[PDB]
Amino acid sequence: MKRMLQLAKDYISYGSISYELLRKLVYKHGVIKVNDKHRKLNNENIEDAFRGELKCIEEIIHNIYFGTEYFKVCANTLIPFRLKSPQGGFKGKKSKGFTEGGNLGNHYDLIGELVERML
């Protein structure tokens, strides 16, 4: 997966967020799939998504953080998040790399500065 992000670096900025910000994403922007249709992510649609194995939203965030055997099924039932433009705008350019002066590329742990303004 790291080699795939190397080739697609002209459109992608990626990092590694903490636990508290990961908890903030799912409660605001969360859409579940059941029978190939998007739904509201309630406590009842979680039942029909996982056939009764998971009964709460907090069960999902525990499995993405500590990588368990339920990683692939929980990460796939979420559709991609849809975020806003950043409050305050981009600093340099959008085209150049991060170490060059722009925004694209690998932020290692400083991705938590960009996502919270877009959140």
Partner: protein
């Protein structure tokens, strides 16, 4: 930043102490550790500068390296002005050159930024092109430039030519004194 219009006491560049080593393998577990100090704006910019330096002195590719720990160094400033001498290597159009300058500032973070202001006119290059070797505090009788030796002598007095207006208004009547 109350009186000035830019932060001259805490510039964007800081000081970071870095350390790294190679990832362990079967042929070579527990390899050698290294340490240095690079000046940058965050630890991510300082990670990229330090790993390129380790590419040249040794054949260590940065894809196999692992970052151990990076901490920042701050200095309890008193407020006395000191003398500093910086030696560095800059990259220009024709090739590389090495020079030497002497400055006067409060701390070595601040004395570095007085070099970037002088290099914007005499050298005309981006700030990432200068590589700083060392910053040291100079005692007396090592000052090789008359500019530092002229200001180091005690009891200085010189006036100021007044050319700035004291009102941020569009128009004032004639004979009001902008002192």
């Amino acid at each position: 930043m109350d009186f000035a219009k830019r932060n001259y006491t805490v510039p964007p560049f800081k000081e970071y102490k870095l350390s790294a080593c190679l990832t362990p393998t079967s042929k070579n577990p527990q390899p050698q550790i290294y340490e240095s100090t690079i000046y940058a704006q965050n630890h991510v910019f300082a990670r990229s500068k330090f790993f390129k330096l380790l590419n040249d002195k040794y054949k260590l590719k940065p894809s196999k390296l692992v970052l151990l720990g990076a901490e920042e160094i701050k200095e309890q400033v008193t407020g006395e002005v000191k003398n500093y001498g910086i030696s560095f290597v800059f990259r220009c159009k024709k090739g590389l050159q090495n020079s030497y300058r002497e400055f006067r500032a409060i701390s070595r973070v601040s004395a570095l930024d007085f070099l970037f202001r002088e290099a914007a006119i005499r050298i005309r290059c981006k700030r990432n092109d200068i590589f700083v070797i060392d910053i040291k505090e100079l005692e007396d009788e090592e000052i090789k430039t008359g500019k530092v030796a002229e200001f180091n002598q005690p009891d200085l007095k010189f006036p100021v030519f007044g050319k700035y207006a004291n009102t941020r208004d569009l128009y004032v009547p004639v004979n009001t004194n902008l002192s």
